[PDB]
Structure formats: structure tokens, C-alpha cells
Scaffold this active site. Structure first.
Site, PDB file in Angstrom:
ATOM      1  N   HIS G 201       0.801  -1.216   0.000  1.00  0.00           N
ATOM      2  CA  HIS G 201       0.000   0.000   0.000  1.00  0.00           C
ATOM      3  C   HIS G 201       0.836   1.271   0.000  1.00  0.00           C
ATOM      4  O   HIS G 201       0.269   2.361  -0.130  1.00  0.00           O
ATOM      5  CB  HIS G 201      -0.945   0.001   1.195  1.00  0.00           C
ATOM      6  CG  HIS G 201      -2.227  -0.722   0.940  1.00  0.00           C
ATOM      7  ND1 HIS G 201      -3.438  -0.277   1.417  1.00  0.00           N
ATOM      8  CD2 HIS G 201      -2.486  -1.857   0.254  1.00  0.00           C
ATOM      9  CE1 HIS G 201      -4.389  -1.108   1.037  1.00  0.00           C
ATOM     10  NE2 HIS G 201      -3.839  -2.074   0.327  1.00  0.00           N
ATOM     11  N   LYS G 227     -15.645  -7.303  -7.364  1.00  0.00           N
ATOM     12  CA  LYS G 227     -14.758  -8.074  -8.219  1.00  0.00           C
ATOM     13  C   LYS G 227     -14.036  -9.163  -7.439  1.00  0.00           C
ATOM     14  O   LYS G 227     -13.750 -10.230  -7.990  1.00  0.00           O
ATOM     15  CB  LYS G 227     -13.761  -7.138  -8.895  1.00  0.00           C
ATOM     16  CG  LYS G 227     -13.031  -7.730 -10.080  1.00  0.00           C
ATOM     17  CD  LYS G 227     -12.104  -6.705 -10.685  1.00  0.00           C
ATOM     18  CE  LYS G 227     -12.161  -6.719 -12.188  1.00  0.00           C
ATOM     19  NZ  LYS G 227     -11.444  -7.883 -12.759  1.00  0.00           N
ATOM     20  N   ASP G 228     -13.744  -8.924  -6.161  1.00  0.00           N
ATOM     21  CA  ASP G 228     -13.183  -9.975  -5.318  1.00  0.00           C
ATOM     22  C   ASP G 228     -14.239 -10.982  -4.878  1.00  0.00           C
ATOM     23  O   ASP G 228     -13.919 -12.162  -4.692  1.00  0.00           O
ATOM     24  CB  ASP G 228     -12.497  -9.362  -4.098  1.00  0.00           C
ATOM     25  CG  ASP G 228     -11.174  -8.693  -4.442  1.00  0.00           C
ATOM     26  OD1 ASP G 228     -10.638  -8.941  -5.541  1.00  0.00           O
ATOM     27  OD2 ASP G 228     -10.673  -7.913  -3.608  1.00  0.00           O
ATOM     28  N   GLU G 271       2.434 -34.782  -0.067  1.00  0.00           N
ATOM     29  CA  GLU G 271       1.358 -34.096  -0.755  1.00  0.00           C
ATOM     30  C   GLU G 271       1.880 -33.498  -2.057  1.00  0.00           C
ATOM     31  O   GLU G 271       3.083 -33.307  -2.246  1.00  0.00           O
ATOM     32  CB  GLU G 271       0.771 -33.001   0.130  1.00  0.00           C
ATOM     33  CG  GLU G 271       0.078 -33.510   1.376  1.00  0.00           C
ATOM     34  CD  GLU G 271      -1.415 -33.687   1.181  1.00  0.00           C
ATOM     35  OE1 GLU G 271      -1.867 -33.764   0.020  1.00  0.00           O
ATOM     36  OE2 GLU G 271      -2.145 -33.741   2.192  1.00  0.00           O
TER      37      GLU G 271
HETATM   38  C1  HEM Z   1      -4.600 -21.471  13.776  1.00  0.00           C
HETATM   39  C2  HEM Z   1      -4.541 -22.268  12.698  1.00  0.00           C
HETATM   40  C3  HEM Z   1      -4.548 -23.823  12.587  1.00  0.00           C
HETATM   41  C4  HEM Z   1      -4.823 -24.770  13.490  1.00  0.00           C
HETATM   42  C5  HEM Z   1      -5.253 -24.611  14.952  1.00  0.00           C
HETATM   43  C6  HEM Z   1      -4.682 -26.060  12.868  1.00  0.00           C
HETATM   44  C7  HEM Z   1      -4.907 -27.264  13.480  1.00  0.00           C
HETATM   45  C8  HEM Z   1      -4.827 -28.490  12.873  1.00  0.00           C
HETATM   46  C9  HEM Z   1      -5.076 -29.758  13.506  1.00  0.00           C
HETATM   47  C10 HEM Z   1      -5.489 -29.940  14.978  1.00  0.00           C
HETATM   48  C11 HEM Z   1      -4.884 -30.718  12.606  1.00  0.00           C
HETATM   49  C12 HEM Z   1      -5.033 -32.238  12.851  1.00  0.00           C
HETATM   50  C13 HEM Z   1      -6.464 -32.676  12.588  1.00  0.00           C
HETATM   51  C14 HEM Z   1      -6.522 -33.424  11.286  1.00  0.00           C
HETATM   52  O1  HEM Z   1      -5.521 -34.074  10.919  1.00  0.00           O
HETATM   53  O2  HEM Z   1      -7.573 -33.369  10.612  1.00  0.00           O
HETATM   54  C15 HEM Z   1      -4.503 -30.083  11.362  1.00  0.00           C
HETATM   55  C16 HEM Z   1      -4.210 -30.704  10.175  1.00  0.00           C
HETATM   56  C17 HEM Z   1      -3.630 -30.112   9.079  1.00  0.00           C
HETATM   57  N1  HEM Z   1      -3.433 -28.759   8.891  1.00  0.00           N
HETATM   58 FE1  HEM Z   1      -4.080 -27.288  10.136  1.00  0.00          FE
HETATM   59  N2  HEM Z   1      -4.297 -25.873  11.562  1.00  0.00           N
HETATM   60  C18 HEM Z   1      -4.203 -24.513  11.361  1.00  0.00           C
HETATM   61  C19 HEM Z   1      -3.832 -23.911  10.184  1.00  0.00           C
HETATM   62  C20 HEM Z   1      -3.289 -24.540   9.089  1.00  0.00           C
HETATM   63  C21 HEM Z   1      -2.651 -23.892   7.976  1.00  0.00           C
HETATM   64  C22 HEM Z   1      -2.473 -22.377   7.792  1.00  0.00           C
HETATM   65  C23 HEM Z   1      -2.277 -24.818   7.101  1.00  0.00           C
HETATM   66  C24 HEM Z   1      -1.554 -24.424   5.789  1.00  0.00           C
HETATM   67  C25 HEM Z   1      -1.261 -25.256   4.791  1.00  0.00           C
HETATM   68  C26 HEM Z   1      -2.640 -26.121   7.649  1.00  0.00           C
HETATM   69  C27 HEM Z   1      -2.440 -27.377   7.116  1.00  0.00           C
HETATM   70  C28 HEM Z   1      -2.810 -28.582   7.675  1.00  0.00           C
HETATM   71  C29 HEM Z   1      -2.628 -29.886   7.084  1.00  0.00           C
HETATM   72  C30 HEM Z   1      -1.990 -30.186   5.713  1.00  0.00           C
HETATM   73  C31 HEM Z   1      -3.115 -30.796   7.923  1.00  0.00           C
HETATM   74  C32 HEM Z   1      -3.152 -32.317   7.692  1.00  0.00           C
HETATM   75  C33 HEM Z   1      -4.570 -32.652   7.243  1.00  0.00           C
HETATM   76  C34 HEM Z   1      -4.721 -34.125   7.019  1.00  0.00           C
HETATM   77  O3  HEM Z   1      -4.094 -34.677   6.086  1.00  0.00           O
HETATM   78  O4  HEM Z   1      -5.484 -34.749   7.780  1.00  0.00           O
HETATM   79  N3  HEM Z   1      -3.254 -25.898   8.862  1.00  0.00           N
HETATM   80  N4  HEM Z   1      -4.483 -28.722  11.561  1.00  0.00           N
END
Ligand code: HEM
Ligand code: HEM
Ligand code: HEM
Ligand code: HEM
Lengths: 48, 52, 50, 59, 122, 70, 376, 376, 48
Positions: G201, G227-228, G271
Site C-alpha cells: 500500500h 470483483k473480489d 502431498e
Molecule cells: C490457527 C490455525 C490452525 C490450526 C489450529 C490447525 C490445526 C490443525 C489440527 C489440529 C490438525 C489435525 C487434525 C486433522 O488431521 O484433521 C490439522 C491438520 C492439518 N493442517 Fe491445520 N491448523 C491450522 C492452520 C493450518 C494452515 C495455515 C495450514 C496451511 C497449509 C494447515 C495445514 C494442515 C494440514 C496439511 C493438515 C493435515 C490434514 C490431514 O491430512 O489430515 N493448517 N491442523
């Protein structure tokens, strides 16, 4: 000096107060929040 | 066993059909409201002395 | 106030100076994206309903 | 060309406190219609395969 | 080496003329010139060269940029009668900019900096 | 806020004095053809390189699998 | 006038309502709002999933299953999180490719590009440690393979590996610390995104013409909000399709097996959004050289605003070479998912060499030749 | 200048190095920097703690014990995180009492006071749900007594209560969601703290004299860095004493017993910083009226910039009344740790009545009388 | 641009480059980093 100081000094007259129409238009927002809450919860035929 | 791996497949598909229908209608409504706002700009007339 | 001392335009019969001294009522907009309604079309717009 | 009516404008559109409850009742009925259409199409297509079809068949 | 470049220079000139032909065909539909493709924010020498210009040249450059941006918003090109009059290679900036860059190269051999900086906002 | 010297006349029409989406059906085939005319060379060189290298790699992988047979 | 009386109204009005924006921005300038919306979606669904997940090796998989079946709306939340990660990476990769095509990192926007590269590195680490949390076979074995790259560093490699693991192998302390780091890093992403947006900005956005646009600016809130919204609805359609109709399309079936440290899978793959880095690593038959090559890729990404010349449509040679770069990175994505083979090793080596050639040779030199062609 | 070319350095310079501050500020203006230091310390210790804590019943107590005896430096981390909440509340309470003494919330700093009251409410909720996490007797029974107070709102009572619990009693879903809410709320605290500091910088700070100080302002970064460092070293001394010599002095011994839903302890009292609200609640013989009085205290806190007239010295009647208010609040803090007795009920009712009398009658009316005496 | 455009425009000259004394005094910070790392890790048998 915003609040009770405005009314102690005599700055809140019968004038500068909102009109009856202004209060009714603001008061019409009471039905909107009631209808919105009833739309969100939907307690149908819950009135006694 | 296919039910055991995905026990809520029917409910997921019903919700997905409703979501896809709703979002597809909302895409047209949002395109309408986008084009209405941008119309005084897309049809404006600019006249200047530059010829080049 | 006079426009020569306030706006200070260039002198000549340029395209901008002609519209500045006498604007035309036959304004042409661009119609490649939107076709205009007939001029003077009254009534509250149908876009609210949409 | 097509234009919203003045008398219909003065009732449901000029004030937001009248516009919003009309919006909510229209939203309710739109959700009901979409639910009805989706459920009818799904039940018609998958007739004879659901659990309720077996239960009503066993009556 | 010497005539190495001697011969390698007509091939450079031919490639440059072909490049300018293609890009000037692309530029003329927007009503732009080759010197309009230089941003005072992107280069501080171009910002210095632009304030050395008479006001009508700057007014014309701004008018051309405004017309091109309006055309880009409308997804349009210029009409045929305007498009046949476009001169994409009529320079208004190259002499002043070449002088500015020569002055900066001259100051740098004596350890002096340029007497201007980047455009800083806020 | 960054004074810009410029001389122009600007005209603008109300958004309730023109249509909204009716011209979108007329211009849709022309815009499709214009898009492919503008981005034809890049999409083609992308497709040629990606699918040619992928096809050559998959072919030679299949030949490698066949060479391990008895 | 009312926003002149409160600071918070004034900042919001200036940076959201009345912010000038080029009038000719096309739909390639929607990747930033979509990336922000996907970050907000990931944070919300993750906060909601954390109320039912247990970060222990005896209860992690079981709590995932219980959340899937017994928690109301738990399947929607879990599938939304797992597929919103992939859509987050899609939107961010398209945003970066837009910047690479237009040369948007150039002056005076070097800070924007550098904070972007920082954001992308934090995003990669966040997703990698989030994938370990279900504690499946892929979750265990990918963490084992990737954190074993620290032993490529001599002398102090195994010590850093054991310090990161909390033991002699990937086990319960690894899962607990990964859960804490994974909860924490999205808030750093939100802060980095706020800084990244406030850096842009200062000068504004670039336009598709690549020229100065200060003569034609319009308010952001009235015009680019709708537009967004249009692009947000197109993203919501794809999100709905992926959540409800094909929920395990972008996943792996081996992550539905519980983790076993005594039997590895036949094909350990990450992945899809880490497959190009994995192909770069697998193509080089030396662990230290592979780690160095990945670091040099990210160093070349950092050095783009200072070595890169060449931008959008009117700079045609680099515009043509952009599509070759795009084909190269998609070939790297495809090669990562395939097994080790002499032809795949050769093709991966050539593709990595072409990526380095494009980043370090084409962008300075060809950019300089086309500047001399156009303005010399 | 080097800070004039990067926008990050310009903001940091403007708000931390060259910010003009009154030169006659005494050591009671160090409350805010100490509160920020305590917030940062709590965030760091907790993020370290969450790598060894398991948020499940039948694992939570054992994970805290494993943290205490087996994790290297784990006992220091736990005791620091436990006593840091007490020191955080000590510092924030002294900060609020400073603002009450000097009339710091008046025009034009009403937004600063309101954002402070919001920060205090979020701090209270954060500390309570973090106190539930070790899953002892005090944790379980305090969470039971406080959350089963939503049965005072008519009709919509136990519905909200059972939705909070995730069941019919405080159990594993309540603990599991309390872990996520407790991890998340301190980042909202940090953002609200940044907004709170940014609201003060619009007009700058008041001075002990209570007069306009625009003529005598000095740079923050040289003069008030070492002055904050001195107070930070005093706070570090008190913190080190509390951690290493009296680690369980401010706690309750019953929280070292594992939670039993079928056996209740003899005396159920919260931590010391919640005791004044507990005394206000426990003194009134009606649940709905107690919740109404608790809400009315915070409503009167929000209304203080618009009803409170009168500052520090040279306004001597309100200055003297401040000490009666301080004695009243400390008496309410003492009464909350006692048993319910008719004399303690009578004294707590009188103390609550005087608290409302001072907040709603003394501050406007006595302040107006002081203004009429001084400038009338 | 400032990185390679400045080299290509001829703006990087020996008279504009930092001196050898400046490069000596700037490069003396390398010993500070080494002794800081040795102070942090203390991985020595150097004390004897
Ligand atoms: C405050 C933010 C977040 C919290 C509290 C959080 C919490 C969690 C938790 C508890 C799990 C395990 C539950 C599960 O496996 O289904 C999980 C899985 C995952 N999170 Fe998040 N997450 C957050 C943000 C993000 C962000 C920003 C990403 C960016 C790519 C991300 C990517 C993933 C991935 C790839 C998994 C594995 C999913 C799977 O294959 O089951 N998470 N997250
Ligand atoms: C969570 C991730 C991100 C968010 C929320 C975000 C947000 C934004 C937004 C809102 C814009 C303004 C409009 C637009 O161009 O879409 C923008 C512009 C920009 N972003 Fe991103 N961004 C993210 C990641 C990145 C990354 C990873 C890079 C590069 C490595 C990057 C580089 C840029 C650049 C160079 C611009 C200026 C482009 C221009 O205005 O022409 N951003 N970003
Ligand atoms: C984590 C909590 C808090 C932090 C980090 C914080 C931070 C600060 C800081 C750094 C200052 C400037 C220096 C100072 O005067 O101490 C300040 C001033 C102030 N704070 Fe706080 N504060 C917090 C809580 C509160 C609360 C709970 C209140 C009121 C209910 C409050 C009200 C004020 C007021 C009125 C001022 C202006 C004082 C004056 O200039 O006379 N703050 N705060
Ligand atoms: C990101 C920030 C924070 C995190 C991750 C965190 C983490 C934790 C964890 C994991 C526990 C349970 C382990 C244990 O009790 O030993 C806990 C307990 C606790 N938390 Fe924190 N915390 C944070 C910030 C805060 C803040 C800001 C406060 C106070 C305003 C606070 C107050 C408490 C209290 C009082 C306990 C009970 C400790 C005990 O009695 O053992 N926490 N916290």
C-alpha cells in the site's frame, strides 16, 4: 468532558436532543434484531 | 466395506448438490452486481487533444 | 471569475477547448460493453429487484 | 425498459428496517424450495435403494 | 574482437528492428510509444529525465497513458482511423534520459553519487 | 496525493441508465477467440514441452519395465 | 468526517474503502484476496478441529476417526481443513506465477517480493508439520525421511536430528512439539500477511499494461469488493466440489493406515504441493547437494528483485520464456510422484538445470537485451 | 536518513526511538511495559509447555507430572508459567489503579481506557480456562461452579450450559475445547495490546502533575529504555524468588489431587486474582442478581471516561476517596477466600455497595464539586 | 532497478566501491560471529 460534563454545563437542551421521528426510526431497529434472532434459531410456534 | 470407509457419502452428496446449485446461482447474481457497479467506468467517454 | 485567469487554458480550437466553450447535448458513450437506455428513462431501477 | 414499480418501491424498498425482514422471509422460502427440489430429485433417482424403501417394503 | 563486434553489430541491428516492429505493432493499438513504457517509480533516472521536460510534453505523456489505461479497462483497441496515425517510435525522452545517464556515469568515475534518490512515499 | 497534470473531458452515465449483462452474450464468442488469439503461442509451447517430455519419459519407462522381463 | 474522529475508522477507510487502485486490473489480480480468505478459512477450521484432536500417539488417529463419525459437522470441518490446505497452495502458487510473469517484484516493490518469499517458506513448514498430526503411515514416514536430511550436515547432523526428534526416533515427543509448532505458525502467517499487504500500500499495485497508472485510479472498496466477491464465489464452488464429492482425491490412501515404525510403505510420497522440491531433491544423488540446490532455489527467489529484468506483455522474449518455465515446474511436480528410474533421474536433472538457467541466466541477460532492443 | 528509506524502520523509529514523552514521568508509568513483558513471557513459556502437555482426561495429570520431573528445565517452565499469571495480574491491576488515581481515561484517551477494559476481560477468561487445564480438583470444581452459572438467564439456561460442556457435565469435551480456546486467546491479547498502545500514541501520555506537557517532551528510546529496564529487573527479582523459593505459595494444595467428579473438596475457591469478583458473587443471595452485579461492575468500568471527573493531586477529595476505594477492593479480595458466614455476608454486601457508590456517585458528583471549587 | 542494472549501466566503478580498509574493518565482524558461537555452544577442549 463528554458525558455528564455536557449535561452539567447546560449543553443538553430540549433542542439538540433527537426528535420523536428520529427515535422512532432508531426504535424501528428493535423489530429487525427480533426477526433476525427468530430467523437464526427458528423456534416455530413456540409462543406459549 | 465401502460404506464403512465413507459412512456419510449419501448425506455428503446431497449437501454437495445443494451447495453447488446455490453457489452457481450466486455466481450469476454476483456477476450481475459486479457489472452494475462497473458500468459507469466501462462505458465512460474520454476526449483529449492527443492524436499521436 | 474569468476562466483565462483561473483555469488558464491553451489558446486554439482544440477538441477540449471546443467542448469547454460550448458543450454538446449529444454525448456519445462507449457502447461495446453496455447499451444505454433511451435518454430520460424514468422510474426506480429494476436492479433492486434483481 | 423494464422498471420497478413505484408503489412496490415505497413499501418494501425505501426503508432498511422493512427491507431486512422481507429479505429474511424470502431467504427462508428460497431455502425451503431448494431443499424440496434437491430431495425430490435424489429420492426419485435412487428409488428402491434407500433404507426407508426397504422398511416401507416390509410393512 | 573489434570487427568482431563490427560484424556482430548489423545482426544486432536487424534483431532490434524486428523486435521494435513486433512490439510497436503491439503498442500502437493502445496508442502508446516506446518511451511511455518507462516508469519514474521503476527508475530514478527516468524520474530525473521527466522533470527536465517542458510541461506540454508531460501533459501529452499523461494523456496517452490515460487513454491506454482506459482502453485496457474496456478490453478495446483504437479504431482504424486512429490506429493508422499512431507513431510508436517518435521519441520525446531518449535524448534527455541519455544525458542524465551520461552525467551519472561521469559522476561515478570521480566517486560522486547522483544528485537525486528514488521516489519515496509516506 | 500525487498531482497529475492532464487536460481532458470525462463523461459518465448512471448505472441505472444502461443494461448490465445483455451485451455479455453477444461478445462472448468474440472474447473467446480473442483470448485464444492472444495466448495461443504460450499455451501451445507449454503444451508441447510438457506433454512431449512426459510422453518421452513414460515411453522410456515402459521400455525399462520391458527390459527387466525374462 | 466520522472516520476523521476515530483512528481505527481512519486507517480502515484509507486502506480498505478509499484506497486508489488501477482501473484496468484484470482477474489475475485476485490471488491475494483469495489467499487471505484461504488463510482465514484454514485458521477457523483448524481452531474448530483442535477442540477434538488429541496430540498423543495412542489417541491421535482414534480422535481423528471419532471427530469424523461422532462429532456433529466434524467430517465437513476435517475435509474442509485438509482440502483447504491444497486450495491455499493452489492460490498462492498462482499468485507467485502472476508475479513471475509480470515481474512485479521490481523496484519499488522489493520488500513485497521478499516478504512473499518469507510467507511461502513459513507456509511450507506449517503444512508439513500439520500433515504429521493424523499419525498415519505417510504422516510418520514422511517426517522420518525429511527430518533425516539433517544428517547430511557433517559433525553436528545427528545431534540436531535427535534434538528435533526428542529421542532416537520419531515418536510421541515429536508429535507433541509438532502440534504446538503447528498451532503457532499460522498466527505468524497472519502477521506476515498484514506486513506484506501494508508494504504494497506504500506504492500501489502494478497494472496489466506495465505502465505508470497514477493518472487512472479508482476507489478500492466500491469497485474491487464486488470483483473480489466474484472470484471468492468461483473458489467456493471448487471448495464445495472437493469437500463433498471427491474428499480423498488430493490425498493418499496410506495415511488411513495407522503408523508403523517397523514396516515402511512401498512408495513414500508427500502431498502434491511439495512434489517439485522432492523431485529436485531426488534428482541429485547426493543429500548435501540436494539440500544446497533447494536452498539455492530459494536464494534465487529472494534475489529476483535485484537480478530480474523483464516484465509483462510488451517484453516478448521473456514473456515467451515464462511458459517454458511453467512447463518446467509442472514437469517437476509430475516427476516427484514417480519412482526412481534412470530416465526419471536424467529428466529431473535436466529440469532442475533448466530451472536454474531460467532464474539466473535468462532473467538478467535476456531482460537486458530486450531493454537495449526497446530503448537503446 | 537510513530509517527514511524503509517503511518498517520509519514506523519503528517513530514509535520506539524518537517518540516524545513527558520528562517528569515517575516509576508508576512503568506498568504498561511490565505488562507487555509478562504477556510475552507467558506466551513463550506456554508455547514451550504445549510441547509436553496432552489435553485429554486420563493423560493430563500424568503429562504435567512428566513435564515436572522428566523434561529438562520443565519444572522451571511450569512454575514460571504458573506464577507468571499471578505477576501478570499484579502488574495489570496496579496499572488499572494508576489509571483510576490519575483519571487517565478522560478526554481524549477514552479509547485507551475502553481497549484496556476489553483486554482485562480477555485476560480473565484466558486465565480461568488455562487454570482448568492441569485437571486437578480445583480445576474441575471451579470449572463446574462457574460454567453452571448460566442457569440464571431465564428459559435459555441449561441449553447454553450443555452446549458449553459438550455433554451433561464437565468432562473430556470441555477440557479438550478449553485447551484450544486457551491456546488461541493470548494472540487476541497481543493484537489488542498493539491496538491499545497505538491508541495512546495519538495523544501521548499524561504526567503526574496533570497539566499539559507539550512544552517539555523528550525522546522515548534513550531516556525511557533504561528506566523500563530498572523496573523489569525488579520484576525479574520477584519472579525468580517466586519460581525458585516459593513455587506453590500462591496456589492451592487441592489442585495436586486428580479430579474426582463424585467427591467435592471442603472449600472451593479460585486463584487470588479472581477473588474480588467471587466475593461480590458470593455475597448476594441470588444467582441472577450476582451475575447482574458482576456485569454492572464492568459496565461502570466502561462508562468511566464519560462519568468520571477528577484526577490525581490538586483534586484532593477524590484523591483521598481513592484510598477508601483501594481498601474496599482489597477487603473484597480478602473476603473471597473465607467461608460463608452471616457477618462475612453482611460485610461483603456493604463492600459491594460502597464499590458501586464510589464508581457511580463519588466520581461524577465529587469531581463536579471539585471543579466548581477550583475553577468556579 | 538497483542490483544488476547498476552494473550494466556503468554505475559501479572502482572510485565508488568501498575501500580495502573498509573491507578489512567490515570483515573483522567474522571473528565476532565465531567467538559468539564458541561462547554459545562452548564445544571446546580449549580451556585445558
Ligand atoms: C490457527 C490455525 C490452525 C490450526 C489450529 C490447525 C490445526 C490443525 C489440527 C489440529 C490438525 C489435525 C487434525 C486433522 O488431521 O484433521 C490439522 C491438520 C492439518 N493442517 Fe491445520 N491448523 C491450522 C492452520 C493450518 C494452515 C495455515 C495450514 C496451511 C497449509 C494447515 C495445514 C494442515 C494440514 C496439511 C493438515 C493435515 C490434514 C490431514 O491430512 O489430515 N493448517 N491442523
Ligand atoms: C498468505 C499469502 C499471501 C497473501 C494473503 C497475499 C496478499 C496479497 C494481496 C492482497 C496483494 C494485492 C493484490 C494482488 O496482487 O492480489 C498482493 C500483491 C502481491 N503479492 Fe501477495 N500475498 C501472499 C503471498 C505472496 C507470495 C508468496 C508472494 C511472492 C513470492 C507474493 C508477492 C506479491 C507481489 C509481488 C505483489 C504485488 C503484485 C502487484 O501488485 O502487481 N505474495 N499480495
Ligand atoms: C496486557 C495488558 C496491558 C498492556 C500491555 C498495556 C500497555 C500499556 C502501555 C505500554 C502504556 C504506556 C505506558 C504506561 O503508561 O504504562 C499504557 C497506558 C495506559 N493503559 Fe495500559 N496496558 C494494559 C492493560 C491496561 C488495562 C487493563 C487498562 C485499563 C482498564 C489500561 C489502561 C491504560 C491507560 C488509561 C493508559 C494511559 C495512562 C496515561 O497516559 O495516563 N491498560 N498501557
Ligand atoms: C500462547 C499463549 C499460552 C499458551 C500456549 C499457554 C499454555 C498453557 C498450557 C499448555 C497449560 C497447561 C500446562 C500446565 O498447566 O502446566 C497452561 C496453563 C495455564 N495457563 Fe497458560 N498459556 C498461554 C498463555 C497464558 C496467559 C496469557 C495466561 C494468563 C493471563 C495463562 C494462564 C495459565 C494458567 C493460570 C495456567 C494454570 C497453570 C497451573 O496451575 O499449572 N496462560 N497454559
Amino acid at each position: 468532558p463528554i458525558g455528564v460534563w455536557s449535561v452539567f454545563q447546560g449543553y443538553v437542551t430540549p433542542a439538540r436532543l433527537p426528535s420523536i421521528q428520529t427515535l422512532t426510526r432508531v426504535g424501528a431497529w428493535g423489530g429487525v434484531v427480533v426477526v433476525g434472532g427468530l430467523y437464526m434459531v427458528q423456534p416455530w410456534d413456540w409462543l406459549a | 466395506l465401502a460404506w464403512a470407509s465413507y459412512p456419510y457419502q449419501d448425506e455428503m452428496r446431497v449437501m454437495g448438490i445443494k451447495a453447488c446449485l446455490m453457489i452457481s446461482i450466486l455466481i450469476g447474481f454476483a456477476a450481475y452486481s459486479k457489472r452494475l457497479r462497473w458500468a459507469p467506468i466501462k462505458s465512460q467517454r474520454i476526449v483529449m487533444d492527443v492524436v499521436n | 471569475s474569468d476562466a483565462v485567469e483561473v483555469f488558464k487554458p491553451e489558446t486554439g480550437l482544440t477538441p477540449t477547448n471546443r467542448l469547454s466553450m460550448a458543450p454538446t447535448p449529444y454525448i456519445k458513450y462507449d457502447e461495446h460493453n453496455h447499451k444505454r437506455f433511451p435518454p430520460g428513462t424514468e422510474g426506480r431501477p429494476f436492479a433492486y429487484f434483481v | 425498459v423494464m422498471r420497478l414499480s413505484e408503489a412496490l418501491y415505497q413499501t418494501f424498498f425505501k426503508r432498511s428496517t422493512v427491507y431486512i425482514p422481507m429479505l429474511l422471509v424470502g431467504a427462508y422460502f428460497s431455502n425451503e424450495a431448494i431443499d424440496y427440489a434437491v430431495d425430490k430429485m435424489w429420492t426419485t433417482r435412487n428409488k428402491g435403494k434407500l433404507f426407508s424403501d426397504i422398511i416401507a417394503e416390509r410393512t | 574482437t573489434s570487427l568482431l563486434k563490427q560484424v556482430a553489430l548489423p545482426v544486432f541491428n536487424s534483431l532490434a528492428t524486428t523486435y521494435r516492429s513486433v512490439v510497436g505493432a503491439k503498442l500502437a493499438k493502445y496508442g502508446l510509444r516506446f518511451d511511455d513504457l518507462q516508469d519514474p517509480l521503476k527508475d530514478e533516472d527516468v524520474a530525473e529525465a521527466l522533470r527536465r521536460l517542458p510541461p506540454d510534453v508531460v501533459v501529452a505523456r499523461n494523456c496517452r497513458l490515460r487513454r491506454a489505461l482506459d482502453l485496457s479497462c474496456k478490453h478495446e483497441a483504437l479504431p482504424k482511423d486512429l490506429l493508422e496515425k499512431q507513431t510508436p517510435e517518435l521519441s520525446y525522452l531518449q535524448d534527455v534520459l541519455n544525458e542524465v545517464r551520461a552525467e551519472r556515469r561521469e559522476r561515478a568515475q570521480l566517486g560522486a553519487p547522483a544528485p537525486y534518490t528514488r521516489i519515496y512515499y509516506d | 496525493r500525487q498531482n497529475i497534470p492532464l487536460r481532458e473531458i470525462l463523461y459518465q452515465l448512471s448505472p441505472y441508465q444502461q443494461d448490465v449483462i445483455r451485451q455479455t452474450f453477444t461478445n462472448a464468442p468474440k472474447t473467446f477467440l480473442r483470448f485464444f488469439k492472444e495466448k495461443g503461442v504460450g499455451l501451445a509451447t507449454f503444451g508441447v514441452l510438457f506433454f512431449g517430455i512426459k510422453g518421452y519419459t513414460e515411453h522410456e519407462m515402459h521400455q525399462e519395465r520391458l527390459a527387466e522381463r525374462y | 468526517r466520522m472516520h476523521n474522529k476515530i483512528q481505527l475508522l481512519s486507517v480502515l477507510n484509507t486502506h480498505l474503502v478509499a484506497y486508489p487502485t488501477p482501473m484496468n486490473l484484470n482477474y489475475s489480480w485476485n490471488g491475494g484476496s483469495l489467499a487471505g480468505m484461504m488463510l482465514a478459512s484454514q485458521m477457523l477450521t483448524g481452531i474448530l478441529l483442535a477442540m477434538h484432536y488429541v496430540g498423543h500417539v495412542d489417541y491421535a488417529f482414534a480422535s481423528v476417526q471419532h471427530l469424523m463419525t461422532d462429532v456433529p459437522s466434524g467430517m465437513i470441518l476435517r475435509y474442509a481443513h485438509a482440502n483447504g490446505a491444497s486450495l491455499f497452495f493452489i492460490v498462492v502458487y498462482l499468485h507467485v506465477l502472476r508475479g513471475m510473469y509480470y515481474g512485479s517484484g521490481a523496484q519499488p516493490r522489493e520488500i513485497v517480493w521478499i516478504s512473499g518469499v518469507v510467507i511461502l517458506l513459513v507456509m511450507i513448514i506449517t503444512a508439513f508439520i500439520g500433515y504429521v498430526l493424523p499419525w498415519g503411515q505417510m504422516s510418520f514416514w514422511g517426517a522420518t525421511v525429511i527430518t533425516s536430511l539433517a544428517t547430511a550436515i557433517p559433525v553436528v547432523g545427528k545431534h540436531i536430528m535427535y534434538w528435533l526428534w526428542g529421542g532416537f526416533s520419531v515418536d510421541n515427543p515429536t508429535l507433541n512439539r509438532f502440534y504446538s509448532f503447528h498451532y503457532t505458525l499460522p498466527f505468524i502467517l497472519a502477521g506476515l500477511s498484514v506486513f506484506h499487504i501494508a508494504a504494497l500500500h506504500q506504492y500501489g499495485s502494478t497494472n496489466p499494461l506495465g505502465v505508470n497508472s497514477q493518472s487512472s485510479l479508482i476507489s478500492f472498496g466500491s469497485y474491487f469488493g464486488a470483483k473480489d466477491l466474484v472470484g471468492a464465489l468461483f473458489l467456493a464452488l471448487v471448495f464445495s466440489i472437493l469437500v463433498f464429492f471427491y474428499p480423498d482425491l488430493l490425498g493418499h490412501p496410506d495415511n488411513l493406515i495407522p503408523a508403523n515404525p517397523y514396516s515402511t510403505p512401498q512408495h513414500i510420497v508427500p502431498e502434491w504441493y511439495f512434489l517439485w522440491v522432492y523431485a529436485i531433491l531426488r534428482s541429485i544423488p547426493n543429500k548435501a547437494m540436494g539440500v544446497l540446490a533447494i536452498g539455492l532455489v530459494f536464494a534465487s527467489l529472494f534475489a529476483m528483485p535485484f537480478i530480474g529484468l523483464g516484465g509483462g506483455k510488451f517484453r516478448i522474449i521473456t514473456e515467451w520464456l515464462y511458459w517454458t518455465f511453467l512447463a518446467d515446474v509442472l514437469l517437476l511436480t509430475w516427476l516427484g510422484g514417480n519412482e526412481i528410474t534412470p530416465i526419471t533421474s536424467f529428466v529431473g536433472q535436466c529440469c532442475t538445470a533448466y530451472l536454474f538457467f531460467y532464474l539466473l541466466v535468462c532473467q538478467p541477460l535476456v531482460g537486458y537485451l530486450e531493454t537495449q532492443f526497446a530503448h537503446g
